[PDB]
Amino acid sequence: STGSATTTPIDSLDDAYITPVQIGTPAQTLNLDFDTGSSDLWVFSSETTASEVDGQTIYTPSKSTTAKLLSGATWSISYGDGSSSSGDVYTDTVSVGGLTVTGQAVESAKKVSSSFTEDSTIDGLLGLAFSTLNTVSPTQQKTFFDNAKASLDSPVFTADLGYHAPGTYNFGFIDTTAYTGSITYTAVSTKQGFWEWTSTGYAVGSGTFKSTSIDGIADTGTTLLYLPATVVSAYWAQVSGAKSSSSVGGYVFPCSATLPSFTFGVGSARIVIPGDYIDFGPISTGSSSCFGGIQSSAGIGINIFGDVALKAAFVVFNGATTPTLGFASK
Template structure:
């Protein structure tokens, strides 16, 4: 069997598995990732751009503990902050349009705080895979400014991964064109966005120095003088509410969406938006559930996720109970969910995250999710417990429900994160 025929057969089998089994068992998901990795390795000899990851980087990156030192004086004095409208996809993802190439090819991408790479699907994915996954795909042959950056990328989204190779082209967002920008062309994409009209990812995370990652879209936006400061900020609305559109502000913060005073926390890791939490407590004074823990802002999850036992005590103190049928804390379950009596939700105390000595309070409206199940209202805690992660991972992940409550400022120049209470708007 020839190489192309073997590729077609394997990709057909992998795609069929995805199409007929939306919820992958862990073993099956790992098997698919292994198959995709093997295919990528076999694909390399046939295409010149799929070379080993550790090949010399043609665009070497300076150490980025303070990435904008030495570049601030080069910023254009007339550059102004830009607001980018974000589309809310049922409180699960927030996306915005970007264009790549000359002439421009448009894509709708979800922002990601956890990774720095921007990627879109490639036209060079095998035909069988393209038929099973309907996304817009970048066609490098149509762009006169395209070049290939001889390395591959691999981004892990828990049980799914995006795998492909890096290219270089112009990328435009909010009318700002970033030239010679490295981005990923995905040969295998995770099935995260099915039915949501999202094509790829806009990476807004910190660069991983240890892996010599190339400058992100925002890094180059700053170095090319397109924005006035190495700061971006995010306001997220609630789906179906009367709030204004969600907004990503490039180059500063927009005071129209938040209260005046920010609480700042220093970034404690060089490759992610991580900071220290002094403690977590209830406004009723019923106990401190954690102290001296590390937290990360995580746009990949809709919820707040914390250590299993601490979250169990917190939710129990609030009156929550493990979801019916849950095997319990001694089981091998990975995530622990809790439910409340909907008639008592409005009277629940605030959950307070103490950061740099200041209270960041979440009301029950922020941390309780109300849904309908068989015609009845179900109230679920938006604070999940999770079994211990890897040693180098943070204890808490503050997801989209936290970011909806707090306007968040990401200051790359000073390596800090700022939080200001998002302004309340009338509900429809």
């Protein structure tokens, strides 16, 4: 089997991308953020405390004939941005893009923190890192990818994220029309539970490529590209009005600049980020300062290839028993 689904940015800055998923029988359709940096499928539900629910769509397990309470199990997750949720667990049928798994754990939120209440576009998360990071206790639960691989025509999914535009998640096949040249695969370490890998170096604009190892994770669930302090200072030293601003938390630059490109290495291949991608947007509507898309990971402790970098490429998540990551230009 395969599945294919359109993914769309939640806003005009491509802050994050939602993809409809159908849970339950008959299907209730909720728009989830597919997050390669975490391993829980959780949703807003009829369980959720009501004054924490805003305009999201809720899962109502009492309405689905295939839902079953997983007795005893609870969950509690907090993410890199500070936000957090917890609750209890059902198993149900969940389909994405045509592809259906029965008995997927769907984690039902009792409580969500502020940032989730405040974002009306996102009805919960679907985690696609490795299932060792799943928060359900006492027995951790598989991600939708892990439950799907038995039936997939190949044990992969693709991410094809758009710049200010819709794109695609595919499961179980690689669409040869969606990229150009050939895919280069690199090894993944799953020792910390992420799709973690080491990039072979970087170039800024049209200067030299510097071979230096950057160990990072490919994370559809993080908006920006977070890289070590000195590589990030090397990029913005090429943008004449850029400075680091403690007030806004990052490098800003005049929205009128043309930014140089940024290249990252994958084995012997190179992925080029166009500079307009790194112009994240204006720090407020109307302002003449813009927010950069490459910022220092010193404060987070790990380098993150977020959607800035991933939407410049077609990305293969190869979930074979030794997993790899594939990059192609598109």
